[PDB]
Ligand binder design. Sequence first.
Ligand SMILES: CC1CC(O)(O)CC(O)(O)C1
Ligand SMILES: [Zn+2]
Ligand SMILES: [Zn+2]
Ligand SMILES: [Zn+2]
Ligand SMILES: [Zn+2]
Lengths: 327, 339
Amino acid sequence: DRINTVRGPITISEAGFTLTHEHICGSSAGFLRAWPEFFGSRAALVEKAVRGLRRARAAGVRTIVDVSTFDAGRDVSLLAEVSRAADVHIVAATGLWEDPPLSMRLRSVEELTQFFLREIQYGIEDTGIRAGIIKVATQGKATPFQELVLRAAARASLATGVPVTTHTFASQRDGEQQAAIFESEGLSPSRVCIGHSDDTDDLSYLTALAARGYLIGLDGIPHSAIGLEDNASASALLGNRSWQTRALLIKALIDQGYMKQILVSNDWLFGFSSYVTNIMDVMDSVNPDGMAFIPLRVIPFLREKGVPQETLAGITVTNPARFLSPT
Amino acid sequence: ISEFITNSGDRINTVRGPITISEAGFTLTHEHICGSSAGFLRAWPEFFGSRAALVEKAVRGLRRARAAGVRTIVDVSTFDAGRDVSLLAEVSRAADVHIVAATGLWEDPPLSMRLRSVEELTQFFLREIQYGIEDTGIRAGIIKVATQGKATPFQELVLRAAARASLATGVPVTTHTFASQRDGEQQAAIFESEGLSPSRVCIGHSDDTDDLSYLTALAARGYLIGLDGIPHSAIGLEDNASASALLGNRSWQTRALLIKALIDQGYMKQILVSNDWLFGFSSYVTNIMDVMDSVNPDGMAFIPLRVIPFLREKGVPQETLAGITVTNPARFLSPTLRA
Ligand SMILES: CC1CC(O)(O)CC(O)(O)C1
Ligand SMILES: [Zn+2]
Ligand SMILES: [Zn+2]
Ligand SMILES: [Zn+2]
Ligand SMILES: [Zn+2]
């Protein structure tokens, strides 16, 4: 019936148009509190995120899923503040991303399961805010620790019904190994979104996963360093494929019959400290629409390609609701 | 005369505010309340039982050290070692033991630090010394840095940023070494290329090595020698591989006799001693704090209760031991003039 957000539980019908892979701030544990001047100030970051989320709201977005984990610097009090002041629901995440500190990397699968369950069932830190999704990551073949995280995420999902969403190196087909580990724990593919799947052009990789029941996260549509070819760091992070190429993978999976399993997002942020210093300004300079890019640019592009309204509403409303509802 | 006056004079920053140099007293220069990771104590306090259990454990431990004569500890936990200065302030008030907090970076920096330039790191260290840590207003009184063998390129940047922050603020620098790889020599070279005075640098974990020529060469150059892990020993724990790997096979007596050896060779003024103890420990294996507590129940009181009597009956005068534990830290922690 209910999805946990940073403002409390909401009914499934209240989620509406939902972006399923977003960030208020991509950082590191403790960093925003220790060095807020990196972002100008905490107050400036709040103002920027509220302005950006209000723009997405005006474009039709009603909910975002912030898939920042502990080690990506999730500050759930920031999420709550920005959610309240933009009147946009925010679902918070547990799990671990690609930068776990020693106090996490030394933990057993049983210990990690307890930590994920704490954030889902009890709350994050001392805030009482409960996570509504579990985030995990690989970058190619899983490290031994990442195998533990994937298993703990599966166990936490089985205990609570909250879904699992993943970071992949899509061009190394990471979703296949993630799926194998999840299924070895008894997790239903319908509880799993294989993310960053628009980073690859290998449609056969994506359709094979979708034919097994997985959700496919086409979540980085505006990420492109076209026009930034003299910028090595932006090119390495954003890639040289266009947003149109990424968006046409949405149409391709629709055309192949998988509209009920597509999840679309921007993978945008309003602050970004875990990469080179200038990256947030560079990213903003090529996508000023920010999180409004999906509703303002991708939807009109697909509609004029012939995707009907019912299909676009199915992808942006029905699929996230089915995914997020604890099952 | 001025050794006796506590109601006025120059001051050092603690988690409870500024104190005069004379108030510092018996000072342990390398300790931890909790060895963790950034944000970890707040995200998963049940790892330590509870935050309140950790507080009570630390307060009892500090009171034990205080009854043994300790008046001040330097908590050399950085941001990435999970320093929680609000925890430090709470336990300092409850135990009435002064705590100096640290800036710098240790061996587990996150991406948001690893990607930063020397200039950016300099600004972060200056923020924590000149403005305060997080939103607490508590100012760091020492800069902590680390190598584990030959420095990585990032570790070099950290050492240079530490030196620049030290010159700009007057606060001293203290280091983590892999002592058997002679890390202090490369650290010294980098520090000296930045113009930092050796008398403002403690080369830490120096009791992990038996190579006296390495230590006396650094002390002869004016460096402070941190003999800071005296009770760390896995003797009796040989079937415990994780405890053996962390604590080593050398006895506390062997470590303590390095203190006497440096005294005997004329380097008393260059020695700093400590326990490198903690009351919570999450950045290693799960059982490690209970294991460590089982072989050193005295905790931070090990230096006053065990090392001082051992050295005294070996003929080290009381006044020499008081110079090492009171005067030497006072000179180290007292800020010098800014550049
Ligand atoms: C925090 C984000 C930054 C990014 O560049 O969008 C990649 C990511 O893996 O989604 C994590
Ligand atoms: Zn990702
Ligand atoms: Zn992301
Ligand atoms: Zn150390
Ligand atoms: Zn230490």
